[PDB]
Amino acid sequence: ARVTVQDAVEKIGNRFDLVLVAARRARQMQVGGKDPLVPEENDKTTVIALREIEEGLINNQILDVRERQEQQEQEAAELQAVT
Amino acid sequence: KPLVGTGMERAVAVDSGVTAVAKRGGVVQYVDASRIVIKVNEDEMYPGEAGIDIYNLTKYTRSNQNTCINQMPCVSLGEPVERGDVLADGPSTDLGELAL
Amino acid sequence: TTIKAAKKMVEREEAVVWDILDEVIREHPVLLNRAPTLHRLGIQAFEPVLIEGKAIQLHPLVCAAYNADFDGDQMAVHVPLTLEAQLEARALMMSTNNILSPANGEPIIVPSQDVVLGLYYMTRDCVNAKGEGMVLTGPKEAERLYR
Amino acid sequence: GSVTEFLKPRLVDIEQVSSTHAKVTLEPLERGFGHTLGNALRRILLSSMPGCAVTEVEIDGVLHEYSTKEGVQEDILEILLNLKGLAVRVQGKDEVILTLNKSGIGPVTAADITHDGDVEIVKPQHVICHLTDENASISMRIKVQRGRGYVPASTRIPIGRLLVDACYSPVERIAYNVEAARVEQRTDLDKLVIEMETNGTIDPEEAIRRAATILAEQLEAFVDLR
Amino acid sequence: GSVTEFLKPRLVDIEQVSSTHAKVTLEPLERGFGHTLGNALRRILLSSMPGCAVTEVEIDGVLHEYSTKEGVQEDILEILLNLKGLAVRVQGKDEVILTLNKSGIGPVTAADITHDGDVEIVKPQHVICHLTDENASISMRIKVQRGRGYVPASTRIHSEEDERPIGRLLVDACYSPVERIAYNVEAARVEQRTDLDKLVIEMETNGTIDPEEAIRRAATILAEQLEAFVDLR
Amino acid sequence: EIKELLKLGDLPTSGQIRLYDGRTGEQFERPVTVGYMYMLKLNHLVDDKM
RNA sequence: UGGCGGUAGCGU
Ligand SMILES: [Mg+2]
């Protein structure tokens, strides 16, 4: 369902960290069991990752802050479990 | 056979040893899909000889290129033959003409 | 139940194996490369479409990029098997991305042999052709009249 | 399996691009049957579908197609082109004469045609002409007849009447495409996609049904005995 | 008689030039239906005509196709190729086993097939092989099936359930009995319409199919395929 | 000589006949060159290369 | 369960 990624390239800006962020997101949904932010029209993980960057729901900054969010959350959960 | 040719197909077919060529003239005493027995004429007779030529055609023998080498007769019983006349058609040969 | 059973369903060519193969190649790019890889465009990523036969079917418009003609040439296909490689195949090595030659910036996808002839024949005018001089409501009317 | 059986079409996917635009899809078809069905359907649709269309028009004050009218800035050819695209449905009779009269401003659309009950304009907002002069009066007498297919005015060829090409068939851009389709391991099947754009008189999904019914009735003589 | 009602074409003549060449005339047709109908019938007939063809062979002493028999003038593969061209008509069933037994010097024609009653040999003079010696006999068991289209040996053997013994030779089956179709549309005279056309279909077959039956079958196939479009969900 | 041989066979001298489309059935706009040619199957088979 | 050498051919 994806042929061109020119808009994704211009959204990321350099066509190189786009590949890295798309691969990271694809691994997150494929291995980490994450839920895609866009409906999947019977598509692979890479295509879904590329498709949910087009409208800006995934980029390096928000992905980093979101990963930090659940890592703080799991650290707090472990601390509460210890106590 | 090539519908359009150059006339050199006969020479190429005959000169190559892929086709069976009658050594002596005569009549086809016994034709078969695998062997041909030709009763030679009295003119080409040899002293103390019955006068029959036996040609054992090679059937379905592999070539150096893993292809098929096969000879098929092109004569019938009682058909007179002469020296140099073709008796069997080799691979890629039709009635003594090269057919690639 | 076991991967041995997986191969045993695979090589026997069960009916569901074709469906599984269609599922796994839906969005999995494959890299096609010609033997002389003179420049960057010698290897390009394409989306596979399953066909019957033993020959790889190539889009005509990319042939000029491959310097390939259909008189016995052979091509090699490689399958990326990691997420990163699939991402770069889709985003960097895809045929749609390569439109301009990196050597000089000229376009690489142009009609060559039959598209040019067909467009030239279609876009031509006589002086006494059938239906000359009429007025048409639009292109659809022209197509209907031609058909 | 059996000699007398054939792969009947299935998975009839129909999508509506617009109100008068359709795209039908049929996946399972015998090898080469997609072309056989598509070409026949296309030919029947664009050459044998009955319908009502404008055949001739009477224009007051104009005696030829290349004349000029000061009331309307559009040429006579433009007026004929605008009238040609009008779609009219007639019930109960073959030919109908309609009258149009307009004056004042020039947003002349199909809604200004005199109401007669039998005639039903699918698009009354279809523009016919445009008047520039304030006291410019335009009076026209159009004739709409029920025919079949496309009949150009050249073959049809008294000062007032002007002939316009009649498009009785209510169909535009009927295009069929047959490409590959695989069922079980047989990849040699044909999948047929038909894209059509009706003028607006009838639903595009009904044009296919009517054409298929016409073709089936054409073969009834040999079909009935089997 | 009007624009809404179309004139229904019907069969009017069947001119049998020969046992295989035939002409079928259909009239009347209404301004373009002739070309459409002719093209559709030509496409259907050339691909969807059922017919009987030879599928399996079994010679007495022959064990594989690449061998030869003592006495026959042609190779076993040649015999199979000539058998492929045999034209028969089978009534009642789609599966028949025929027996051929010949001896003595001479050609072995289709007339040497044992009479079966429900199987008719359209070409009784079709040669198969030539016995070039006395005391040499040929005994064959020919297998003939009814089908459609062209089914090669590999497609049939893909099942591999039978596991046929050595000596049973498989031959490609061309079940199609129609070999050539040519449609021609001309003007037809029907009282005073002066705009109707007639369609003449010239068909060359193997003689195992009736031209009228072939036209009827093609029309039935077209109607059955078009009923799906008639319904349209 | 070729034209004379074609005339003997009651064939067009130009060597081009009128063909029809197998699928749509419409006649081609221009006559096409139809004849008989000697074709050779070279020893480069796809099953030996795939 | 590999290498070397020679020969011929294919696509550039
Ligand atoms: Mg090449």
PDB file of N, CA and C (backbone and C1' of nucleotides) and ligand atoms in Angstrom, chain C residues 69 71-73, chain G residues 11-12, ligand 1:
ATOM      1  N   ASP C  69      18.600  -6.094 -22.072  1.00  0.00           N
ATOM      2  CA  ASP C  69      17.706  -6.404 -23.175  1.00  0.00           C
ATOM      3  C   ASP C  69      17.296  -7.867 -23.078  1.00  0.00           C
ATOM      4  N   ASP C  71      17.234 -10.790 -24.648  1.00  0.00           N
ATOM      5  CA  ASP C  71      17.766 -11.748 -25.609  1.00  0.00           C
ATOM      6  C   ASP C  71      18.696 -12.750 -24.936  1.00  0.00           C
ATOM      7  N   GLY C  72      18.388 -13.139 -23.700  1.00  0.00           N
ATOM      8  CA  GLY C  72      19.186 -14.101 -22.968  1.00  0.00           C
ATOM      9  C   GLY C  72      19.868 -13.563 -21.730  1.00  0.00           C
ATOM     10  N   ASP C  73      19.652 -12.300 -21.377  1.00  0.00           N
ATOM     11  CA  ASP C  73      20.265 -11.742 -20.180  1.00  0.00           C
ATOM     12  C   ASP C  73      19.685 -12.387 -18.926  1.00  0.00           C
TER      13      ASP C  73
ATOM     14  P     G G  11      24.776 -13.632 -26.132  1.00  0.00           P
ATOM     15  O5'   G G  11      24.551 -12.599 -24.942  1.00  0.00           O
ATOM     16  C5'   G G  11      23.335 -12.597 -24.212  1.00  0.00           C
ATOM     17  C4'   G G  11      23.471 -11.867 -22.902  1.00  0.00           C
ATOM     18  C3'   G G  11      24.138 -10.504 -22.959  1.00  0.00           C
ATOM     19  O3'   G G  11      23.276  -9.483 -23.429  1.00  0.00           O
ATOM     20  C1'   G G  11      25.005 -11.734 -21.139  1.00  0.00           C
ATOM     21  P     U G  12      23.634  -8.689 -24.780  1.00  0.00           P
ATOM     22  O5'   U G  12      23.936  -7.207 -24.287  1.00  0.00           O
ATOM     23  C5'   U G  12      25.271  -6.743 -24.144  1.00  0.00           C
ATOM     24  C4'   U G  12      25.593  -6.433 -22.704  1.00  0.00           C
ATOM     25  C3'   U G  12      26.642  -5.358 -22.474  1.00  0.00           C
ATOM     26  O3'   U G  12      26.124  -4.045 -22.580  1.00  0.00           O
ATOM     27  C1'   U G  12      27.144  -7.230 -21.133  1.00  0.00           C
TER      28        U G  12
HETATM   29 MG    MG H   1      21.308  -9.086 -24.053  1.00  0.00          MG
END
